């Protein structure tokens, strides 16, 4: 059996040698002459109130106006960000929700958590209420992230070291992804919706192909658990936050890490990572009660969204690119924006 | 402000009214997390507390003196704990069950208790110990075949605490054995915390009928201590 370990070590050495060969120049050296971004400041336009307990997940709509939120009081709320109105209030069967999703078409929302079920809620009914549509029931661990592809396909991640691709109408798994060795904590669908990534509490991230069911690449730069992941708008890169107080940028074709976002004053782990529209800004939420705006090319801190009284747990930037919304454990949800 | 926008504001007001009406139920409900190993005996505690008074979470409803209590036993989850234990912040109290008859896994239980106690998010959350299976511990100590000194050498130089309150007709040796384990847990309980949270020990068997009242009393004590510290009288 030892020859298997020897072969694994040999292939690992070959992979590391290829990575060293392709690393001709660091990203920072190339970006040395780029004009640094100024001090970005945001001024908390709307504060959304009404949740009774902690907030773990938020998701914007495709119209950049509607907004879903998951709280451990057992409520999903659909907000009208422009007006601070409450459109819907959906009570969940299980109070320990850990993720939520808003379908691209607007007709469905998803939720899930310690109860391993992922529940799809029909929003546009001829009866006027919001009903549970399906209850996906094949995960043997808590469900930490779920993201829609269509109105019939959803992709879930579980504490069970596996992701899945369900068929909502049937209610059965269509493909199970079984490469990780830890609890998958986050999930990010690519802009083209044929690939996606996940970080799974083993200091590694993996790129999967939705049709086939296999791990394309594996990225192993981090030191501790990976908590959040998100794609660059291009679709050829993604940033990852972790519990060792660092964010890192991975590119798929280079198959390495390009830049680590860190500071000696930060000894707290990231809980949410999102990009801006142009990819010039990387927003990351921390356990030290506030978020941070990074410059994804110069790796210099360029802002602090210090407005929360507790842990920041979720972070979303609209498709329009106009607003960023932050939810925290203080039962609030703030929508930030700039000023000219 | 258009007419439809006024109607939308009205619907939002009604939604907020229902939300406020649910806030009453939320703040009148106390959430407890039940933790234990496979041999702990948390199942019989649930059975005791429910007839009286691939799913990943079990909820148990019980009511003591018109005070609602919600308890949550974790089910179809893996053995790694450091990620889903954060969801149980801001709960009233954590209930920890230990099998005091199995000396081999006592150190594992102590390490688990230490990890729960020292976690960054569970620093304001008290723990209610349930030193389960005292009958087995008695039967094992009186019928001496397993020495506790083989696993904890400090038992040799140990004495029964002065404030011990033995049950009538109980051997001194079983009292010493049952208080040594409590002392081991309380050593971890007191070494840190800065006074923000405490451990309430209890010796329980599989035939007791007064555990819900114990949890009720301990939650009362937790809230009393919290409000006393807020008012700076303690």
């Amino acid at each position, epitope marked *: 059996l030892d020859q298997l370990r020897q072969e694994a070590e040999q292939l690992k050495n070959q992979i590391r040698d290829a990575r060293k060969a392709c690393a001709d120049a660091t990203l920072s050296q190339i970006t040395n002459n780029i004009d640094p971004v100024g001090r970005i400041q945001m001024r908390t336009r709307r504060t959304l109130r009404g949740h009774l307990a902690k907030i773990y997940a938020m998701h914007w709509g495709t119209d950049s106006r509607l907004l879903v939120s998951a709280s451990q009081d057992g409520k999903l709320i659909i907000w009208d960000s422009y007006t601070t109105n409450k459109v819907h209030a959906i009570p969940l069967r299980s109070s320990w929700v850990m993720t939520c999703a808003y379908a691209p078409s607007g007709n469905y929302v998803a939720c899930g958590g310690l109860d391993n079920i992922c529940s799809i809620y029909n929003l546009k009914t001829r009866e006027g209420n919001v009903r549970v549509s399906r209850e996906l029931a094949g995960h043997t661990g808590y469900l930490s992230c779920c993201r829609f592809l269509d109105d019939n396909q959803i992709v879930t991640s579980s504490g069970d070291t596996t992701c899945a691709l369900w068929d909502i109408e049937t209610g059965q798994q269509t493909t199970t992804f079984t490469g990780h060795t830890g609890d998958v904590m986050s999930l990010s669908l690519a802009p083209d919706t044929r690939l996606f990534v996940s970080g799974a509490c083993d*200091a590694s991230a993996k790129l999967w192909d939705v049709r086939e069911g296999m791990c394309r690449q594996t990225f192993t730069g981090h*030191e501790s658990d990976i908590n959040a992941i998100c794609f660059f708008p291009n679709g050829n890169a993604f940033a990852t936050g972790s519990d060792d107080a660092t964010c890192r940028l991975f590119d798929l074709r280079a198959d390495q890490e390009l830049m680590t976002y860190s500071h000696d004053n930060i000894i707290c782990g990231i809980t949410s990572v999102s990009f801006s529209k142009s990819g010039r800004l990387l927003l990351a939420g921390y356990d030290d009660f506030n978020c941070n705006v990074w410059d994804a090319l110069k790796a210099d801190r360029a802002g602090v969204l210090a407005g929360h009284d507790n842990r920041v747990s979720c972070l979303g930037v609209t498709d329009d690119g106009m607003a960023v919304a932050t939810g925290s454990w203080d039962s609030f949800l703030k929508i930030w924006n700039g000023s000219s | 402000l258009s007419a439809e926008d006024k109607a939308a504001v009205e619907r939002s007001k009604m939604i907020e009214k229902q939300l406020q009406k649910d806030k009453q139920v939320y703040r009148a409900t106390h959430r407890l997390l039940l933790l234990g190993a496979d041999n702990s005996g948390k199942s019989t505690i649930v059975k005791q507390m429910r007839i009286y008074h691939t799913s990943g979470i079990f909820e148990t409803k019980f009511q003591v003196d018109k005070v609602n209590f919600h308890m949550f036993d974790v089910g179809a989850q893996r*053995d*790694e704990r450091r990620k889903w234990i954060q969801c149980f912040n801001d709960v009233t109290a954590i209930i920890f069950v230990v099998d005091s008859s199995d000396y081999n896994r006592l150190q594992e239980a102590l390490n688990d208790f230490k990890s729960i106690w020292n976690n960054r998010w569970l620093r304001t959350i008290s723990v209610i110990l349930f030193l389960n299976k005292q009958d087995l511990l008695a039967e094992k100590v009186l019928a001496g075949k397993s020495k506790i000194e083989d*696993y904890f050498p400090e038992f040799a130089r140990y004495t029964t605490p002065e404030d011990a309150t033995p049950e009538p007709g109980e051997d001194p040796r079983v009292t010493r054995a049952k208080y040594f384990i409590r002392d081991e847990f309380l050593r971890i309980s007191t070494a840190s915390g800065d006074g923000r949270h405490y451990c309430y020990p209890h010796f329980t068997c599989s035939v007791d009928t007064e555990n819900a009242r114990r949890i009720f009393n301990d939650c009362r004590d937790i809230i009393q201590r919290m409000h006393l510290r807020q008012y700076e009288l303690l």
Partner: nanobody
Amino acid sequence: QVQLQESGGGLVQPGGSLRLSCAASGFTFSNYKMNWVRQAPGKGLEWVSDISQSGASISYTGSVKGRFTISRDNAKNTLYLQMNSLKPEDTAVYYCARCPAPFTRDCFDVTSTTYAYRGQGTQVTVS
């Protein structure tokens, strides 16, 4: 890549002594609490030692309190376990574990069945 190579096992008579070293690469050694994990054949997975990231706080299981010693060298990125007076109950596969998060005082999953930040193991046996 976070990896931990544990070496220094082998046969030893009762009353003999050994030393276990744990070369650690990839996770800025000085920031993490480190442990030693034992698995006797046919048994579960046990915790035998613990050392802080400075070397001040040291704990033991109790069955090995007076016999084993654990040290640390942050410069060479090594963890040491000086086994001194072994007995036949000590035969097992010894794992050099790392604690999940830096700067923390809680170590949750060091004894889990499939824990990422742990070594492959060294086999220590006693006649």
